[PDB]
Design an enzyme around this catalytic site. Structure first.
Site, PDB file in Angstrom:
ATOM      1  N   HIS A  35       0.796  -1.269   0.000  1.00 15.32           N
ATOM      2  CA  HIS A  35       0.000   0.000   0.000  1.00 15.32           C
ATOM      3  C   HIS A  35       0.812   1.294   0.000  1.00 15.32           C
ATOM      4  CE1 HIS A  35      -3.978  -1.680   0.132  1.00 15.32           C
ATOM      5  NE2 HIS A  35      -3.796  -2.289   1.293  1.00 15.32           N
ATOM      6  N   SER A 104      -4.740  -7.418  -1.117  1.00 16.05           N
ATOM      7  CA  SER A 104      -5.710  -6.511  -0.477  1.00 16.05           C
ATOM      8  C   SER A 104      -6.127  -5.284  -1.283  1.00 16.05           C
ATOM      9  CB  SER A 104      -5.165  -6.042   0.851  1.00 16.05           C
ATOM     10  OG  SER A 104      -5.565  -6.925   1.881  1.00 16.05           O
ATOM     11  N   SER A 106      -8.417  -1.487  -1.488  1.00 11.72           N
ATOM     12  CA  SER A 106      -8.788  -0.333  -0.665  1.00 11.72           C
ATOM     13  C   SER A 106      -9.970   0.460  -1.262  1.00 11.72           C
ATOM     14  CB  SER A 106      -7.562   0.564  -0.416  1.00 11.72           C
ATOM     15  OG  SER A 106      -6.770   0.712  -1.587  1.00 11.72           O
ATOM     16  N   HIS A 111      -6.998   0.932  -5.011  1.00 12.29           N
ATOM     17  CA  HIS A 111      -5.980   0.084  -5.645  1.00 12.29           C
ATOM     18  C   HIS A 111      -5.884  -1.308  -5.009  1.00 12.29           C
ATOM     19  CE1 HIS A 111      -2.688   2.117  -2.929  1.00 12.29           C
ATOM     20  NE2 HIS A 111      -3.252   1.098  -2.299  1.00 12.29           N
ATOM     21  N   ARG A 119      -5.349  -8.512   5.045  1.00 17.65           N
ATOM     22  CA  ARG A 119      -6.182  -8.040   6.163  1.00 17.65           C
ATOM     23  C   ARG A 119      -7.457  -8.914   6.316  1.00 17.65           C
ATOM     24  N   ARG A 120      -8.289  -8.902   5.269  1.00 20.02           N
ATOM     25  CA  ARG A 120      -9.436  -9.798   5.139  1.00 20.02           C
ATOM     26  C   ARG A 120      -8.953 -11.251   4.875  1.00 20.02           C
TER      27      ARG A 120
HETATM   28  C1  LIG Z   1      -3.040 -10.762  10.339  1.00 21.26           C
HETATM   29  C2  LIG Z   1      -2.747  -9.368   9.805  1.00 21.26           C
HETATM   30  C3  LIG Z   1      -2.739  -9.092   8.443  1.00 21.26           C
HETATM   31  C4  LIG Z   1      -2.459  -7.806   7.988  1.00 21.26           C
HETATM   32  C5  LIG Z   1      -2.180  -6.771   8.877  1.00 21.26           C
HETATM   33  C6  LIG Z   1      -1.894  -5.375   8.456  1.00 21.26           C
HETATM   34  C7  LIG Z   1      -0.612  -4.682   8.846  1.00 21.26           C
HETATM   35  C8  LIG Z   1       0.226  -5.140   9.868  1.00 21.26           C
HETATM   36  N1  LIG Z   1       1.229  -4.248   9.907  1.00 21.26           N
HETATM   37  C9  LIG Z   1       2.405  -4.001  10.770  1.00 21.26           C
HETATM   38  C10 LIG Z   1       2.533  -4.964  11.938  1.00 21.26           C
HETATM   39  C11 LIG Z   1       3.863  -4.513  12.526  1.00 21.26           C
HETATM   40  C12 LIG Z   1       4.634  -3.842  11.383  1.00 21.26           C
HETATM   41  C13 LIG Z   1       3.769  -3.947  10.132  1.00 21.26           C
HETATM   42  N2  LIG Z   1       1.088  -3.180   9.014  1.00 21.26           N
HETATM   43  C14 LIG Z   1      -0.027  -3.416   8.318  1.00 21.26           C
HETATM   44  C15 LIG Z   1      -0.525  -2.489   7.286  1.00 21.26           C
HETATM   45  C16 LIG Z   1      -1.656  -1.754   7.607  1.00 21.26           C
HETATM   46  C17 LIG Z   1      -2.158  -0.831   6.696  1.00 21.26           C
HETATM   47  C18 LIG Z   1      -1.531  -0.620   5.466  1.00 21.26           C
HETATM   48  C19 LIG Z   1      -0.385  -1.321   5.121  1.00 21.26           C
HETATM   49  C20 LIG Z   1       0.152  -2.251   5.999  1.00 21.26           C
HETATM   50  C21 LIG Z   1       1.386  -3.011   5.616  1.00 21.26           C
HETATM   51  N3  LIG Z   1      -2.060  -5.189   7.014  1.00 21.26           N
HETATM   52  C22 LIG Z   1      -1.108  -5.494   6.120  1.00 21.26           C
HETATM   53  C23 LIG Z   1      -1.294  -5.277   4.762  1.00 21.26           C
HETATM   54  C24 LIG Z   1      -2.475  -4.724   4.289  1.00 21.26           C
HETATM   55  C25 LIG Z   1      -3.510  -4.396   5.169  1.00 21.26           C
HETATM   56  N4  LIG Z   1      -4.727  -3.822   4.752  1.00 21.26           N
HETATM   57  C26 LIG Z   1      -5.549  -2.974   5.617  1.00 21.26           C
HETATM   58  C27 LIG Z   1      -6.464  -2.379   4.534  1.00 21.26           C
HETATM   59  C28 LIG Z   1      -7.761  -1.811   5.032  1.00 21.26           C
HETATM   60  O1  LIG Z   1      -8.101  -2.084   6.173  1.00 21.26           O
HETATM   61  N5  LIG Z   1      -8.413  -1.057   4.107  1.00 21.26           N
HETATM   62  C29 LIG Z   1      -9.776  -0.508   4.173  1.00 21.26           C
HETATM   63  C30 LIG Z   1     -10.760  -1.687   4.232  1.00 21.26           C
HETATM   64  C31 LIG Z   1     -12.214  -1.215   4.232  1.00 21.26           C
HETATM   65  C32 LIG Z   1     -12.214   0.300   4.136  1.00 21.26           C
HETATM   66  C33 LIG Z   1     -11.525   0.835   5.392  1.00 21.26           C
HETATM   67  C34 LIG Z   1     -10.050   0.401   5.380  1.00 21.26           C
HETATM   68  N6  LIG Z   1     -11.431   0.690   2.976  1.00 21.26           N
HETATM   69  C35 LIG Z   1     -10.144   0.347   2.956  1.00 21.26           C
HETATM   70  O2  LIG Z   1      -9.361   0.722   2.086  1.00 21.26           O
HETATM   71  N7  LIG Z   1      -6.500  -3.572   3.691  1.00 21.26           N
HETATM   72  C36 LIG Z   1      -7.704  -4.235   3.204  1.00 21.26           C
HETATM   73  C37 LIG Z   1      -5.245  -3.932   3.553  1.00 21.26           C
HETATM   74  O3  LIG Z   1      -4.660  -4.144   2.514  1.00 21.26           O
HETATM   75  C38 LIG Z   1      -3.273  -4.635   6.612  1.00 21.26           C
HETATM   76  O4  LIG Z   1      -4.126  -4.360   7.486  1.00 21.26           O
HETATM   77  C39 LIG Z   1      -2.222  -7.045  10.225  1.00 21.26           C
HETATM   78  C40 LIG Z   1      -2.487  -8.328  10.686  1.00 21.26           C
END
Ligand SMILES: Cc1ccc([C@@H](c2cn(C3CCCC3)nc2-c2ccccc2C)n2cccc(N3C[C@H](C(=O)N[C@]45CC[C@H](CC4)NC5=O)N(C)C3=O)c2=O)cc1
Ligand SMILES: Cc1ccc([C@@H](c2cn(C3CCCC3)nc2-c2ccccc2C)n2cccc(N3C[C@H](C(=O)N[C@]45CC[C@H](CC4)NC5=O)N(C)C3=O)c2=O)cc1
Lengths: 201, 213
Positions: A35, A104, A106, A111, A119-120
């Site tokens: 992302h 994932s 957004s 994208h 996440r999901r």
């Molecule tokens: C089991 C697990 C898996 C993943 C992660 C978790 C994560 C853990 N760390 C950290 C941990 C320590 C260092 C790295 N960073 C992240 C992180 C979060 C956000 C962006 C980038 C990264 C790298 N993680 C990883 C990759 C992508 C994630 N998302 C959240 C986003 C999201 O929620 N988007 C929404 C969904 C519905 C609506 C509101 C928000 N519209 C959107 O666009 N999405 C769908 C994603 O691609 C993501 O949540 C956490 C736990």
């Protein structure tokens, strides 16, 4: 010589801790690492909703990115051990499969991101050199659905970052809790346990 | 400015999962009585020497060692990469002050692993050791890092300190090397669980240190 990747972005089968929305949400979408718009590697080339979720098919095009991956793949044990069954060695496809095992999202669709784990739940990323081949990895799909996908798939280099970025994004991944258990779940769920693949999970 | 790293190479109170990982106190002490300074590398890779071992000591709960990470080519790579790591950004805890480099070493190379038959071949920063208790603690000051370890006693630290009062940058690799080696670590099973077991065992509660486990 690009690389396709396919998987489910959202899995109706699963209840979050977070079908109508998506099909409505339809009538150049880019693809990046984890992302981070300084790390665009290529584009989505198809979305499609089906019996079990939203399914996506994206292409990985960036010459600088793929070059890192090639160099980095040359120094990985996991890669060196090759893939299985009758599949043939592909250092680049295997190293992606390891690094960025998850997918994932957004229009409402912003994208698609390749990430270490999604996440999901149920969002395993299948890499490969052929789009038909990657769709053929997922048993829940049907050939009418692959018609929906093939309809869609059948700038310059947008990659700001470098190895160092990737190196840093990589060790974040190391601390995401119970990631390997989550990744094997999306396996026994979306069936890439059954059709053999380049998946390292 | 180098970085010291310390921890247990082997724990006497721990029974292995592989029979080949037996090092008990009588064998360790025999080897210590046996007669360069031992190099420190990344994942047992002779192309990834980042510095050296400055001390080892048999103590009540096991064999402990303090090591120094001197390599400017390595440290530079790390410096550039911590710059782009969300974990590094979130930052350390309690009253500790941010040290991007120190934090990223703590993430990337959370473990120690000995290489042993000059019977001690070398020591390896690695993402997790196959022995339990091999949590690796990084910090800027040798003392400070040994103070992170409860099981240690002043007599043990006097033996340690007596070894760190002892320029050919030995690193021969690059970011690509470390990139490839990182995604290896991603598929070591029960990794985070194992690191946490290591944490509680040796005392390092993490509210007094840069450990990220
Ligand atoms: C089991 C697990 C898996 C993943 C992660 C978790 C994560 C853990 N760390 C950290 C941990 C320590 C260092 C790295 N960073 C992240 C992180 C979060 C956000 C962006 C980038 C990264 C790298 N993680 C990883 C990759 C992508 C994630 N998302 C959240 C986003 C999201 O929620 N988007 C929404 C969904 C519905 C609506 C509101 C928000 N519209 C959107 O666009 N999405 C769908 C994603 O691609 C993501 O949540 C956490 C736990
Ligand atoms: C839970 C777990 C932790 C670590 C690993 C495991 C691993 C998993 N993958 C793979 C997995 C996918 C891609 C990478 N590679 C490795 C690996 C092994 C050796 C060197 C480098 C790497 C990256 N692993 C990792 C790092 C260090 C290990 N050692 C070696 C050393 C060692 O055994 N030295 C001996 C002891 C007795 C005798 C023969 C060997 N003399 C010696 O000096 N040592 C004390 C360890 O801890 C090591 O066993 C496996 C599981």
């Amino acid at each position: 010589t690009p690389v396709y990747v396919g998987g489910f972005l959202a899995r109706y089968d699963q209840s979050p801790d977070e079908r109508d929305v998506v099909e409505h949400w339809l009538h150049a979408l880019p693809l990046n690492i984890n992302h981070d718009d300084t790390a665009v590697v290529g584009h989505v080339a198809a979305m499609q909703s089906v019996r079990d979720g939203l399914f996506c098919l994206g292409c990985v095009t960036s010459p600088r990115f793929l070059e890192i991956v090639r160099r980095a793949s040359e120094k990985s044990e996991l890669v060196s051990r090759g893939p299985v069954s009758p599949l043939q060695p592909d250092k680049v496809v295997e190293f992606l499969s390891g690094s960025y095992a998850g997918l994932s999202l957004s229009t409402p669709f912003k994208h698609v991101a390749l990430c270490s784990v999604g996440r999901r739940r149920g969002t395993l990323a299948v890499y490969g050199r052929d789009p038909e081949w990657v769709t053929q990895r997922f048993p829940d799909l049907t050939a009418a659905d692959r018609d929906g996908l093939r309809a869609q798939w059948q700038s310059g280099d947008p990659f700001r970052s470098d190895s160092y970025g990737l190196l840093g994004n990589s060790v974040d991944a190391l601390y995401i809790r119970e990631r390997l258990p989550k990744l094997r779940y999306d396996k026994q769920l979306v069936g890439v346990t059954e059709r053999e693949s380049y998946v390292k999970a």
